[PDB]
């Protein structure tokens with residue numbers, strides 16, 4: 079899963 | 084803290 | 089409703105204690121109460137609100153993914169029929185997740201966004217709006233999936249337009265917005281090329297502005313730039 | 325009440341799904357529903373019940389300890405007065421913890437223990453009774469603290485007496501009971517010598533019986549024996 083903030 | 088199960 | 093009798097400052101104090109205790113549901117409830125006092129939120133307070141709900145919904149999303157995977161396996165050829173329970177329990181988690189998203193969106197609509205005039209506050213809230221529509225989109229399978237996706241896109245786009253006009257390319261809010269909108273493109277909108285272009289351009293424009301920054305601002309911006317690079321590496 | 329309309333088997337199925345999803349509050353609610361069907365629990369089902377509540381109360385205890393530490397620091401000389409919020413929020417967490425303990429104790433009293441005739445089931449439940457009174461004792465500060473402590477002690481002692489008569493010294497339930505009763509002595513009863521003696525004797529008597537075991541039983545018993553050693557190392 080890709081990085082989000 | 085000591086181990087418990 | 090439940091927090092109506094508690095002072096705003098006490099709600100904020102308790103949200104911070106709840107964070108220290110890793111009690112994110114409590115933290116979110118305190119911050120909801122604080123928002124419902126009706127006053128604008130400071131930067132620190134906006135960050136408390138975001139951390140609380142990110143952690144609550146993050147846990148629901150992870151659970152939903154576990155359950156959806158079990159459910160998909162149940163629908164493969166040669167899988168034994170186990171009854172309605174997997175679907176029911178995935179639906180239960182899903183409904184709870186949707187409820188949290190609706191709560192956040194509700195706070196933004198009543199009345200955080202409309203009172204947010206400064207670029208940093210308005211972009212922050214519009215990013216949140218995009219994010220919680222994105223979480224709704226992750227679980228959407230019916231007649232409104234397109235409209236949910238478009239609601240996320242519209243919120244992110246408004247945030248992007250403001251951030252490009254009003255904030256430097258290293259601003260952590262602008263970077264985080266771009267990071268998340270890029271993930272929206274890749275994971276939700278079936279637009280991996282747009283995702284990759286956005287991440288790359290965002291990274292490169294930030295790189296070019298690092299020279300203007302203090303040591304501490306440099307640290308903050310480079311952290312998120314590394315997330316952009318991490319995604320680019322995953323995708324290329 | 326809420327689970328009254330759901331089949332027993334479906335509650336058990338869902339508890340297992342909740343475990344896979346790390347949804348321990350849901351898992352506990354499902355298992356409470358299953359107990360309230362009124363039938364005895366199998367070994368697997370007893371373990372689902374214990375895992376669920378252990379994880380729920382474990383999280384509450386960790387939160388309580390964070391908050392109690394902040395509160396104790398607030399009461400030191402030279403600490404600035406910050407109002408009632410820390411105490412209030414510690415009390416909130418505490419009350420919730422007490423509620424979970426009361427729920428578990430209630431299931432044991434109505435009617436798990438009284439229907440448990442086999443040594444393995446009865447010892448398992450009495451260990452649980454001791455454990456949840458121990459959690460109550462951790463947070464007790466008033467007129468009933470002694471009685472709560474004695475309730476834990478009595479439950480553990482009954483379990484110990486049955487386990488010594490009916491189970492081999494390597495039995496994992498007997499070992500885990502001894503491990504926890506030893507911690508009760510050290511942390512609750514102000515009896516570190518008793519704690520150390522119990523752990524040592526339990527370890528040594530188990531060691532002497534390992535030769536009787538299969539590979540898989542050996543693995544199960546040695547795991548808990550290592551916990552006994554870990555505590556002994558912490559305490560000596």
Ligand SMILES: *CC(=O)NCC1CCN(C(=O)[C@]2(Oc3ccccc3)CC[C@H](N)CC2)CC1
Nearest residue numbers: 083130131132134135208260261264265308311
């Ligand atoms: C009021 C305000 O300026 N908020 C922005 C903060 C900038 C620094 N932060 C972060 O970098 C993290 O969270 C983000 C949320 C939204 C947009 C960008 C970042 C929090 C720490 C993490 N290690 C990185 C992301 C906090 C918000």
Ligand SMILES: *CC(=O)NCC1CCN(C(=O)[C@]2(Oc3ccccc3)CC[C@H](N)CC2)CC1
Nearest residue numbers: 088366367368370371444496497500501544547
């Ligand atoms: C029905 C039954 O026989 N239950 C006992 C199991 C024995 C093996 N287990 C364990 O070792 C753990 O949990 C315990 C609970 C109560 C008493 C002793 C153990 C679960 C796995 C851990 N790695 C170690 C403890 C499960 C119960």
Ligand SMILES: [Mg+2]
Nearest residue numbers: 094095096097
């Ligand atoms: Mg007031």
Ligand SMILES: [Mg+2]
Nearest residue numbers: 179182183227
């Ligand atoms: Mg649904």
Ligand SMILES: [Mg+2]
Nearest residue numbers: 282285286289
């Ligand atoms: Mg462009």
Ligand SMILES: [Mg+2]
Nearest residue numbers: 330331332333
């Ligand atoms: Mg039935």
Ligand SMILES: [Mg+2]
Nearest residue numbers: 415418419463
């Ligand atoms: Mg109290």
Ligand SMILES: [Mg+2]
Nearest residue numbers: 518521522525
């Ligand atoms: Mg003795």
